[PDB]
A paper describes a structure:
One new defense system is the short prokaryotic Argonaute [name] ([name]), which is activated by foreign (plasmid) DNA to unleash its [name] domain for NAD(P)+ hydrolysis. The resulting depletion of the essential metabolite NAD(P)+ lends to the killing of the infected cell (abortive infection) as a means to prevent the spread of the invading DNA to the remaining bacterial cell population. The [name] system was first discovered in 20186 and further characterized by Koopal et al3 in 2022, who showed in an elegant set of studies that the short p-Ago of [name] associates with a [name] protein to form a catalytically inactive heterodimer with 1:1 stoichiometry. However, upon guide (g) RNA and target (t) ssDNA binding, four heterodimers transition to an oligomer (a tetramer of heterodimers) that unleashes the NAD(P)ase activity of the [name] domain for abortive infection.
To see what the structure of [name] looks like in absence of gRNA/tDNA, we obtained crystals of Apo [name] that diffracted to 2.66 Å resolution and belonged to space group P6522 with unit cell dimensions a = b = 197.18 Å, c = 183.4 Å, α = β = 90°, γ = 120° with one [name] heterodimer in the crystallographic asymmetric unit. We solved the structure by molecular replacement using an AlphaFold13 model of the heterodimer, followed by manual building. The crystal structure of Apo [name] heterodimer reveals an extended [name] protein interacting extensively with the more compactly folded [name] (MID-PIWI) protein. The [name] (residues 1 to 138) and [name] (residues 161 to 420) domains connect via an extended linker (residues 139 to 160) and subtend a concave surface against which the MID (residues 1 to 269) and PIWI (residues 270 to 507) domains dock. The [name] domain makes contacts exclusively with the MID domain, whereas the [name] domain makes contacts mostly with the PIWI domain and few contacts with the MID domain. This interface between [name] and [name] is extensive (burying ~ 2240 Å2) and underlies the stability of the Apo [name] heterodimer in solution. The [name] domain emerges from our structure to be topologically similar to the N, L1 and L2 regions of long pAgos and, by analogy, we divide it into [name]-N (residues 167-280), [name]-L1 (residues 281-352) and [name]-L2 (residues 353-450) regions. A unique feature of the [name] MID domain is “insert57” found between α5 and α7, composed of a long helix (α6) and two short helices, that extends outwards from the body of the MID domain. Intriguingly, in Apo [name], the positively charged pocket on PIWIA that mediates oligomerization is masked by negatively charged residues Asp306 and Asp309 on the loop. Overall, loop and helix αN appear to be key elements that maintain [name] in an auto-inhibited state prior to gRNA/tDNA binding.
Numbering used by the authors:
A (entry chain C): 1 to 507
B (entry chain B): 2 to 39, 45 to 353, 355 to 386, 388 to 432
């Protein structure tokens, strides 16, 4: 028999210097770590969207229960939790008219459709941001259901509902260059063709395109579907709610509130016990399939300290991908550049250099980029590189009962690799964190030297800094939890020079 | 003389009672509640001689609960025996409380509205306490945290209980004594797929790494008949597993790598002459059982193929070898569907449906199905793999099992049903 260890569940600190394991319970009993005095809501959408948002704002004032309030704890109400008020009295409304939606949603091409609608929302957001001062905390994009359905990639609009036609096809759109002639009437139609063709350089999904084209303006946005806030009124042909939130309403309220609270400037919680000077860096890669080069991809880094308000550094594009082995590796230059970006940002924030630098990735680092990392690393700063995979076939089945293994159990293969059960049974909720039998993540100190148990503890603690999800704990550390999200946001605009930005502008 | 009593119906108003008790304690007040302890005479003595303010939770369940009404009657006697016009402070928390269902003793008093906002209700309660000069200590949220952790999280903690677990790692007991490299050289055609041979064999560098013999590939490779078997390099497998072997010709990590690459192919080939069908994945192969086989679709009373809606689900396994830290075969479990029990749906369908089917299975079912499948395609107490005419590997049908020092009390109330119902 092989022996497992147990890693005690890390604690998160809330208000009044109190520490706990469940952010919902800690927020309900004590309150948020940072405190703000009001959420000035900006609302973009139809009048019906504003009505739905105001109805949800009125609802979350009162308590909202779940079905099984042990697995998912109840929601006492916004003011009774955050000590703040999220009132409809402070709503700066910028209306999107119905005819405005009909003008741009019924184009045969998905890319122009999504680009036009994202532009319609973004122009309102940015104009209200600039002209009449910056007086709101978060901008809440209330997305109608039709837009969400038809402004997504691989989504076809019925030909009978098309009102405006397409001018250029998808294959030739990215190669179209507008070159003027000496015929004005001709140049007009050429400019229209270019207007349509430019949208194929953006990703045809409303969410990433809106959040990416809004990066250069630094405006917090929470995108909520109309059917998310009014799921009772979005039924099928059987009179039944399409998205049934009836048994988890409270949990929903816990998620929308906390996330909003983070985007409004306040930090709900931070890590309770962590060593000073530590800094965690999660790598992010996303292949740019638009470019002809099969190796072309975008790179980025997510920095986290003792809280979930991380920092996102956008790297350059390059042949980071190796179609051969299917692992992204960075070339020496970009390794140096990205690590220097991160370390200089750390020095600007903490006025010192990190005592340790843990680089998290899903693959094993090659020596070529690790030496470039070491070149810029200060010196008396331990720099290691950890591999978290999840795709490791090891499953432990409890010998009896339907309940699975308990979260926190860990199997240490050697002084450099171990197995961590971030998912499994958790005695607090008296339920499971995942369906079926949990798959433990595999951790390996691929490059560098450090204690295996300390890295395990740090990862387990890093599964608790998710601000969007107000849940007990996550499956993977925040350093890699939103890697695909950041990657797609960075490749959705294809026209960005973004500086180091906070998480609340991508999250 | 200064305790704050909270009468409440259990467990209908347990959430609000816990919230209010803990918040008032953290704010500095001394509250008395049966929910904060782990018997009627004690309650009576406390309301009569130690309660400064008697708060009653006014809900549909509270106004009809007999014990709550007993405590309220004692509180009425007490209130009469002092001068406190506000000794009884009802807390209206139920917006479904019909007026004709309110108890008479509560309806004649003015309650504090918690129905519109628990925050506003708490502010009003604290204002009434301040105006009544109710005794209180400076804030101490640490005591509220302590009570939350030791009273409410009592039966919800991890305990020190040794627990054994089964795994998906089935060890390999028997290994061929020598892993050999055959210097076939020109005898092996350069453009020949060394993946078509009946025994698992892979290239290294002019040699051919295999567990099989020098002449185990004559029928497919004629020229190997002229090959002198003495040119082969034979390495002790026990020296490869123990790490004793490490030369310039080949390194230990490489040795173990070619060994797993051979074990995988051996599994794939042994699956061919067996009562299982195949399912091609992104890089590996899964193996399942047709509907017609087995006694009523059950091996050892374990359903290995069954019915879902309009199709038939089949439990399947895939194998991948590893030999660090221990030589084992890791078996992953999967689900694959058929329309009639034999022919696959080639699409999404086999994904969505897998998710929708597997959500109904838990630890017991997954473990039973894996162990039952493994024992089914066994050959004794193990599963022989043919890496040669006379060499073979043996994988025990009993998996490597782990054990830990910290376990949990199994919640007899299966909430797994509530969880698996969530199929939205
Ligand atoms: O926030 C607020 C704190 C929590 C307990 C009462 N006052
Ligand atoms: O979206 C939709 C489903 C309903 C509950 C969870 N998510
Ligand atoms: O009665 C009362 C119910 C119990 C849970 C929520 N409100
Ligand atoms: O009970 C339970 C936790 C404590 C107050 C509300 N939610
Ligand atoms: O403070 C207060 C204490 C704790 C529970 C009973 N009364
Ligand atoms: O309503 C209200 C009740 C009427 C009598 C006193 N309190
Ligand atoms: O088929 C399907 C398998 C089941 C586990 C993961 N993918
Ligand atoms: Mn299109
Ligand atoms: Mn969002």
């Amino acid at each position: 028999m092989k022996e497992l260890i147990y890693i005690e569940e890390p604690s998160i600190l809330f208000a009044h210097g109190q520490k706990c394991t469940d952010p919902r319970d800690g927020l309900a009993l004590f309150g948020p770590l940072n405190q703000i005095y009001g959420i000035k809501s900006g609302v973009v959408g139809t009048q019906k969207g504003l009505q739905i948002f105001k109805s949800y704002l009125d609802k979350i004032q009162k308590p909202i229960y779940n079905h099984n309030n042990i697995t998912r704890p109840m929601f006492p109400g916004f003011e009774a939790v955050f000590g703040c008020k999220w009132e409809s009295q402070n709503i700066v409304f910028k209306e999107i008219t119905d005819e405005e939606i009909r003008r741009y949603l019924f184009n045969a091409s998905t890319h122009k459709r999504t680009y036009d609608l994202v532009t319609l929302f973004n122009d309102k957001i940015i104009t209200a941001n600039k002209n009449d001062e910056e007086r709101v905390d978060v901008w809440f994009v209330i997305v109608p259901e039709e837009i969400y359905k038809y402004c997504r990639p691989n989504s076809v609009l019925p030909n009978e509902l098309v009102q405006t036609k397409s001018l250029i096809s998808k294959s030739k759109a990215k190669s179209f260059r507008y070159t003027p002639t000496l015929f004005e009437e001709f140049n007009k139609k050429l400019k229209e063709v270019e207007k349509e063709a430019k949208t194929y350089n953006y990703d045809a999904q409303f969410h990433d395109q809106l959040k990416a084209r809004l990066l250069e303006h630094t405006i917090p946005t929470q995108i909520l579907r109309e059917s998310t806030l009014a799921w009772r009124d979005f039924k099928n042909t059987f009179g039944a709610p399409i998205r049934d939130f009836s048994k988890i309403e409270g949990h929903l309220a816990w998620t929308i509130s906390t996330a909003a609270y983070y985007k409004a400037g306040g930090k709900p919680w931070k890590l309770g016990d962590i060593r000073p000077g530590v800094c965690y860096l999660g790598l992010v890669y996303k292949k740019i399939e638009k470019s002809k080069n099969p190796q072309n991809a975008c790179c980025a880094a997510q920095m986290f300290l003792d809280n979930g308000d991380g920092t996102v550094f956008k790297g350059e594009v390059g042949p980071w991908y190796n179609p051969e082995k299917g692992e992204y590796h960075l070339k020496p230059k970009e390794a140096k550049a990205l690590l220097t970006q991160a370390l200089e940002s750390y020095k600007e924030q903490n006025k010192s250099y990190p005592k340790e630098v843990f680089i998290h990735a899903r693959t094993r680092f090659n020596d070529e980029e690790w030496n470039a990392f070491n070149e810029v690393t200060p010196k008396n700063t331990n720099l290691v590189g950890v591999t978290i995979t999840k795709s490791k076939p090891l499953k432990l089945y409890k010998t009896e009962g339907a309940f699975p293994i308990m979260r926190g159990n860990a199997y240490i293969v050697d002084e450099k690799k171990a197995f961590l059960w971030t998912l499994g049974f958790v005695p607090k909720l008296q339920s499971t964190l995942s369906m079926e039998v949990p798959n433990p993540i595999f951790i390996e100190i691929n490059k560098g030297e450090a204690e295996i148990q300390q890295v395990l503890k740090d990862i387990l603690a890093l599964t608790k800094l998710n601000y969007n999800a107000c849940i007990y704990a996550d499956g993977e550390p925040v350093t890699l939890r939103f890697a695909n999200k950041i990657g797609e946001i960075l490749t959705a605009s294809t026209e960005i020079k973004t500086p180091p930005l906070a998480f609340k502008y991508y999250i | 003389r200064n305790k704050i009593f909270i009468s409440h119906a259990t467990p209908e108003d347990d959430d609000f009672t816990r919230w209010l008790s803990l918040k008032l304690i953290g704010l500095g007040y001394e509250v008395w509640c049966d929910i904060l302890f782990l018997f009627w005479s004690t309650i009576e003595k406390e309301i009569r001689e130690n309660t400064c303010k008697f708060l009653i939770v006014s809900s549909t369940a509270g106004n009809k609960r007999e014990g709550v009404l007993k405590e309220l009657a004692v509180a009425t006697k007490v209130k009469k025996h002092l001068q406190d016009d506000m000794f009884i402070i009802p807390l209206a928390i139920d917006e479904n409380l019909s007026y004709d269902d309110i108890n008479i003793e509560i309806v004649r008093l003015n309650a504090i509205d918690f129905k519109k906002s628990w925050a506003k209700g708490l502010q009003d309660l604290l204002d009434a306490f301040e105006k009544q000069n109710v005794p209180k200590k400076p804030p101490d949220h640490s005591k509220s945290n302590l009570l939350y952790q030791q009273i409410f999280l009592h039966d919800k903690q991890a305990i020190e209980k040794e627990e054994t677990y089964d795994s998906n790692w089935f060890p390999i007991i028997s290994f061929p004594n020598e892993l050999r490299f055959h210097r076939y050289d020109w005898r092996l055609p350069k453009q020949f797929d060394v993946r078509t041979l009946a025994f698992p064999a892979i290239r290294y560098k002019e040699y051919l790494c295999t567990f099989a013999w020098e002449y185990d590939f004559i029928h497919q490779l004629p020229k190997t008949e002229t090959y002198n078997g003495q040119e082969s390099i034979r390495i002790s497998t026990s020296d490869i597993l123990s790490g004793r072997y490490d030369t310039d010709f080949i390194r230990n990590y490489e040795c173990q790598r070619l060994i797993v690459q051979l074990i995988n192919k051996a599994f794939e080939l042994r699956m061919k002459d067996k009562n299982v069908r195949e399912y091609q994945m992104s890089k590996t192969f899964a193996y399942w059982i047709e509907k017609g086989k087995l006694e009523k679709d059950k091996f050892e009373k374990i359903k290995l193929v069954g019915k879902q809606k309009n199709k038939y689900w089949h439990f399947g396994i895939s194998a991948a070898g590893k030999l660090y830290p221990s030589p084992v075969l890791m078996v992953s479990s999967h689900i694959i569907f058929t329309m009639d029990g034999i022919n696959l749906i080639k699409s999404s369908i086999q994904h969505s449906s897998r998710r929708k089917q597997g959500k109904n299975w838990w630890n017991d079912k997954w473990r039973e199905k894996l162990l039952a499948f493994i024992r089914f395609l066994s050959d004794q107490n193990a599963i022989y793999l043919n890496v040669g005419s006379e060499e073979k590997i043996l994988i025990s049908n009993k998996p490597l099992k782990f054990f830990g020092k910290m376990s949990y009390v199994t919640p007899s109330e299966v909430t797994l049903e509530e969880e698996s119902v969530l199929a939205d």
